[PDB]
Amino acid sequence: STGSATTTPIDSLDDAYITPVQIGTPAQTLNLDFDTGSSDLWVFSSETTASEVDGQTIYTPSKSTTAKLLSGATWSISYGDGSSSSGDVYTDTVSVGGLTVTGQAVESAKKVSSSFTEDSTIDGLLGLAFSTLNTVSPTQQKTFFDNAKASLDSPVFTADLGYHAPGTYNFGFIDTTAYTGSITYTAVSTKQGFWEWTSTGYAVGSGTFKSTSIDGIADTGTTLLYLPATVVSAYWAQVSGAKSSSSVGGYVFPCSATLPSFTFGVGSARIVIPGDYIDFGPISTGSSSCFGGIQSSAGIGINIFGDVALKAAFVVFNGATTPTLGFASK
């Protein structure tokens, strides 16, 4: 089997992407944030505290003839941005782009933090990291991809995120019309539960490539590109007026600037992020100070290849017995 679904930016900055997902019988369609950096499929629901729902579409398990309470199971998750959610668990039928999994754990939110409430466009998350990070207790649950894997034509999914435009998540096949050149594959460590790999270096604009190993994660659920302080300083030093602002919480630059591109290495190959992709717009409405799309990871503890980086490529998440990542230009 295969699946194919369109993924759409939630706003004009590409802050996140939503993909429609069918849950239950009859289908309830919710728009979920596919997140290769976490491993829980959780949804706003009829159980979510009413004051914490503001415009989201909810899953109502009592209206699904295939929903079953997973007795005793609870979940609770906290993300790198300080947001969180928690609740109980049902199993139900879940379909993405024509690919159907029965018995998928659907984590029903009883509580969500303010940032989720405030984002009416995101009805929940669909985690695509390794199932060892799933938070369900006392019996850890499998991701949608893990449950679908055996049925797929090939044990893979691909992320093709758009710049200010729709893109695609495919399951079970490589669309060879969706990229240019060849796909370069690179080793993955699953030891932290992430799609964790080592970039071979970087360049700023037309500058020379610096060979240096950068360990990080491919994370569709993170907006920006977080890299070591040395790398980020070298980038922003090429932008007149750019500075790190403790009050704003990162590098900012004049909105009148034209930004240089940023290149990262995948083996001997190179992925170029156009400068425009690094502009995240005014820090506040109407400001002439703009927020940078490349930020320091020094306070995180891990480097993060988020959407800024991934949307410059066609990305293969290869869930074979030994997992690997593939990157192609597009």
Half-sphere exposure of 264 (CA within 13 A, CB side): 30
Q: Which residues are catalytic?
A: 35, 199
State the distance between the two ends of the chain, measured CA to CA, in whole angstroms.
25
Place of tokens 């949804």: 43
Please state, in angstroms and rounded to a whole number, the distance separating the CA atoms of residues 217 and 129: 10
Measuring CA to CA, how many Å separate 204 from each of 11, 37, 262? Answer: 27, 26, 5
Q: Which residues contact 159 (CB under 8 A, 6 or more apart)?
A: 34, 36, 167, 169, 220, 310, 314, 315, 317
Instruction: Write out the two tokens for 90.
Output: 């049902």
CB count within 10 Å of CB 70 equals 20
Measuring CA to CA, how many Å separate 320 from each of 98, 120, 208, 224, 241? Answer: 22, 36, 35, 28, 46
Please state, in angstroms and rounded to a whole number, the distance separating the CA atoms of residues 17 and 126: 11
Instruction: Write out the two tokens for 201.
Output: 């270096």
Task: Give the β-pairing of 28-35 and 124-127.
Answer: parallel
CB count within 10 Å of CB 183 equals 20
